[PDB]
Paper text:
TRPV4 is a polymodal, calcium-permeable cation channel that has emerged as a potential therapeutic target in multiple conditions. TRPV4, expressed in the plasma membrane of a wide range of cell types, is a polymodal ion channel whose gating is controlled by multiple endogenous lipids, and exogenous stimuli including synthetic ligands, cell swelling, shear stress, moderate heat, and ultraviolet light. Human TRPV4 adopts a two-layered homotetrameric architecture where RhoA attaches to the bottom layer. RhoA appears to act as an auxiliary subunit, interacting with the ARD through three loops connecting AR2-AR3, AR3-AR4, AR4-AR5, and with the membrane bilayer through the prenylated C-terminal tail.
Particle subtraction followed by focused 3D classification of the transmembrane region and RhoA-bound cytoplasmic domain were performed, resulting in improved map qualities for these regions for model building. In our ligand-bound 3D cryo-EM reconstructions, we identified strong and unambiguous EM densities corresponding to GSK279 (antagonist), GSK101 (agonist), and 4α-PDD (agonist) located at a shared site within the cavity between the VSLD and the TRP domain (termed here the VSLD cavity). We functionally probed the interactions of GSK101 with TRPV4 by mutating amino acid residues within the GSK101 binding site using patch clamp recording on HEK293 cells expressing WT as well as mutant TRPV4. Mutations Y553A, N474A, and F524A significantly increased EC50 values of GSK101 for TRPV4, consistent with observations from the structural analysis. The GSK101 binding pose remained stable during the simulations, supporting its accuracy. However, in the GSK101-bound open state, the SF and the PHs move closer to enable cation coordination (the diagonal distance of G679 backbone carbonyl is 7.0 Å), which is consistent with previous mutagenesis studies. Meanwhile the pore-lining S6 helices rotate ~90°, thus changing the gate position (from M718 to I715) and the gate opening (the diagonal distance at I715 is 8.3 Å). This S6 rotation between the two states is due to the shift of the π-helix position on S6, resulting in a local secondary structure conversion between α- and π-helix along S6b, which is unique amongst the TRP channels. To validate the S6 gate position observed in the open-state structure, we performed Cd2+-dependent blocking of TRPV4. Among cysteine mutants near the S6 gate (I715C, A716C, L717C, and M718C), only I715C showed substantial inhibition of GSK101-elicited current by extracellular Cd2+, supporting the observation that I715 faces the ion permeation pathway in the TRPV4 open state.
Author numbering:
A (entry chain A): 150 to 639, 662 to 788
B (entry chain D): 602 to 639, 662 to 721
C (entry chain D): 242 to 301
The structure:
């Protein structure tokens, strides 16, 4: 009777249901029998009834519920989960909440519907994973994400059952996590997201004063603030940063306080308990800066407390140590260069050290080798410090983090050769020296006047020049192969010499003498002319077009990128300090702005700023 | 013209010349160290030859005496590529923006 | 007097002036110094100047 019952329930007719209870009683057939359930997805009568209905009044639900009650299988029937993959775990309560009908939600909850059921189907998974909609996999979270304040209010406080707001799904995300996940930067979405977030946080704090909801962390270890920062959702992030609660009862959980006003000047005291961490836990600032592929990183960096904190941190110790860094590195490079120049070609390495100059010469090599080893150790410590960032962190951006690794290798590699491979240690030592000299732009990144230059040269080099060089290499290969084939000698050495001559020509110097020996000289000259014309005239200076366009983008965003680079370098410098010293350099005050519910002082670290307003009269 | 040449000269050209001098120092020191004569006068003569090359004239004859000529040519090619191709006319980008 | 003027209350200003409050007293604290020097607000270091800079025509 599955098809007939499905048709009856879909049509919404109530008279047809008459006589079903006697049939079930006589045949002792439960409403959850496999035959009744749809084989495709284990769907039952109730979800079909709730899916299709007229103005939210299908009118068949109470009769079916009474029938199930008479059969004595109400608990199993109401909360029967869907099987299969796409809609696994879905229940009747989720559907009732989705269709925005309060009456059916009340009915299901009163009759005993489970309120903690989790929907884990692939359709409910995040967008990037394959599911078109994600809401935290909970009824209350689903209601909150769909902008239904009345449903959330009723479900939180019900005489039958209550859905605790501090409940985590399989992913670990709680209601706030899901609300942030679906948050969008659109004008309309942000307003309701913030309103629901504030309402839910206030309710949770009111009901449970001891525990703060935002404290809970997901499996990834992030909090709603940290997750919003990582996902690039500025709309909720900025609101969370400057959250202020006027209510006296629950004003403790506020993040922005008022210090004092003198005339147009207003000084306010922000809180940064978790915004800045001295290695104790992950900080919003590090996640915002180091992480890649963030939609609105530049905008999120330009917030009231972030800029002031960066400025104060830079003034306190950043400038003092940055110049020390530059001086030490330049001195080491000068020592390395002097060691490289005064290298005795005569004799088999290693050499005996007996003379006065040996005292000075050996020290340079020892210092350079120890510096390379120190660089390698620093670069492995840093890699493990950031929890082993993947390829995207190293290769695509922060190229200097990789280059010093290469410099770390060669410098020590040569040493091995210097002990056994005496003959050819110079070949790689000189290349290491060149790379070390060339990779000093990391220290120039910080300077405001020349901060952009290094970033934009690194950007253009790998992206524009290589893309152009693909086509240039196509041309080079074709023309060089053609010219090599054409010439008549009357072979590897001849080909190499011809390639050398052609490269010398390509620079713009040399002489055109090859045509004399070859046959068909006229076509040879025609081909050379086409080569020169195409490459030099068009490509050589048409690359400059998009190169200048790239520099134009960098010029348009020069101020924004410099701020990012300066923040990166100062944070970099900070992170290498020991934990105890970092704690000794803590920034902010210990103002006891307010007392807890029991009266104990909060005594939380904060940071005060000030601004000027003239319209506040 | 006068105001903008005075402005660009001290601000753009010097900022670019810092990086250019880093490259120059590194490459020149490397090449001087690499060559085997068998010293101040030799270094000065090599620097003169390398500058004459940097302009775009002169001849590449130094490789004959030195050992490991292939790496020497590779390094010279990297020098020429980087400086001339990228920097020499990428300075022009921000110069034109100024 | 400076505080009374700042809080925009005319009554207390009248009371202090009538009772004999000094009207030429100068405030020279670092907080009152110019912005670039270290003081967040500068108004000439006088009561009348403070009232004028705060847009209080009646007090002036
Ligand atoms: C000691 C503190 C007061 C400051 C600290 N400087 C140093 O420890 C040393 C400098 C020098 C100079 C000559 C010889 C020996 C040393 S030891 C400092 O401020 N930093 C080092 C850690 N940093 C890094 O490791 C970046 C970011 O992770 N990676 S890197 O590109 O590979 C790099 C950059 C510069 C230096 Cl140099 C070493 C490295 Cl692997 C950042 C910046
Ligand atoms: C335009 C650019 C970006 C692409 C070309 C890459 C260069 C690095 C190539 C172009 C021509 C090449 C040269 C062509 C011929 C030779 C000679 C070869 O050794 C010889 O002198 C041959 C004599 C012999 O072996 O008997 C060593 C490499 C070198 C300099 C090659 C090294 C690499 C060069 C400079
Ligand atoms: C790219 C630019 C902006 C930076 C380089 C600065 C130039 C002014 C340097 C580059 C090479 C230098 C030259 C390298 C070698 C010499 C030879 C030296 O005297 C000699 O002829 C050496 C012979 C001897 O003393 O026995 C006088 C300076 C000169 C021309 C140097 C003078 C200054 C030069 C041209």
């Amino acid at each position: 009777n599955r098809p007939i019952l499905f048709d009856i329930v879909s049509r919404g007719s109530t008279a047809d249901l008459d006589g079903l209870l006697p049939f079930l009683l006589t045949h002792k057939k439960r409403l959850t029998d496999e035959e009744f359930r749809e084989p495709s997805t284990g769907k039952t009568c109730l979800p079909k009834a709730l899916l299709n209905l007229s103005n939210g009044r299908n009118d068949t639900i109470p009769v079916l519920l009474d029938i199930a009650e008479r059969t004595g299988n109400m608990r199993e029937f109401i909360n029967s989960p869907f099987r299969d993959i796409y809609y696994r775990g879905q229940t009747a309560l989720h559907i009732a909440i989705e269709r925005r009908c309060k009456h059916y939600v009340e009915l299901l909850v009163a009759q005993g519907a489970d309120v903690h059921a989790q929907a884990r189907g692939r359709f409910f998974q995040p967008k990037d994973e394959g599911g078109y909609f994600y809401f935290g996999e909970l009824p209350l979270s689903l209601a909150a994400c769909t902008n239904q304040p009345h449903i959330v209010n009723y479900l939180t406080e019900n005489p039958h059952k209550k859905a605790d707001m501090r409940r985590q799904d399989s992913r670990g995300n709680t209601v706030l996590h899901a609300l942030v996940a679906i948050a969008d930067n659109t004008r309309e979405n942000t307003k309701f997201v913030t309103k629901m977030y504030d309402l839910l946080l206030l309710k949770c704090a009111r009901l449970f004063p001891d525990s703060n909801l935002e404290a809970v962390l997901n499996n990834d270890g992030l909090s709603p603030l940290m997750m919003a920062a990582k996902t690039g959702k500025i709309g909720i992030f900025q609101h969370i940063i400057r959250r202020e609660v006027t209510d006296e009862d629950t004003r403790h959980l506020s993040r922005k306080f008022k210090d004092w006003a003198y005339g147009p000047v207003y000084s306010s005291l922000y809180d940064l308990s978790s915004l800045d961490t001295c290695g104790e836990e992950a900080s919003v600032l590090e996640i915002l800066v180091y992480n890649s592929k963030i939609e609105n990183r530049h905008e999120m960096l330009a917030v009231e407390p972030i800029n002031e904190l960066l400025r104060d941190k830079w003034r306190k110790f950043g400038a003092v140590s940055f110049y020390i860094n530059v001086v030490s590195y330049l001195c080491a490079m000068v020592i390395f260069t002097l060691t490289a120049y005064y290298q005795p070609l005569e004799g088999t390495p290693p050499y005996p050290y007996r003379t006065t100059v040996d005292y000075l010469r050996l020290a340079g090599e020892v210092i350079t080798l120890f510096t390379g080893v120190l660089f390698f150790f620093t670069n492995i410590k840093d890699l493990f410090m950031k929890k082993c960032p993947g390829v995207n962190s190293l290769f695509i951006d922060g190229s200097f983090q990789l280059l010093y690794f290469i410099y770390s290798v060669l410098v020590i590699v040569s040493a091995a050769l210097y002990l056994a491979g005496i003959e050819a240690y110079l070949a790689v030592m000189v290349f290491a020296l060149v790379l070390g000299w060339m990779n000093a732009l990391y220290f120039t990144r910080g300077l405001k006047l020349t901060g952009t230059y290094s970033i934009m040269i690194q950007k253009i080099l790998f992206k524009d020049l290589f893309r152009f060089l693909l086509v240039y290499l196509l041309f080079m290969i074709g023309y060089a192969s053609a010219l090599v084939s054409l010439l008549n000698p009357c072979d590897s050495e001849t080909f190499s010499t011809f390639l050398l001559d052609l490269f010398k020509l390509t620079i713009g110097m040399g002489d055109l003498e090859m045509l004399s020996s070859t046959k068909y000289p006229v076509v040879f000259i025609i081909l050379l002319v086409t080569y020169i014309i195409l490459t030099f005239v068009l490509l050589l200076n048409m690359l400059i077009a998009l190169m200048g366009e790239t520099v134009g983008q960098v010029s348009k965003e020069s101020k924004h990128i410099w701020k990012l680079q300066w923040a990166t370098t100062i944070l970099d410098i900070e992170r290498s300090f020991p934990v105890f010293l970092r704690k000794a350099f803590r920034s902010g005050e210990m103002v006891t702005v307010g007392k807890s519910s029991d009266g104990t002082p909060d005594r939380r670290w904060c940071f005060r700023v000030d601004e000027v307003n003239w319209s506040h009269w």
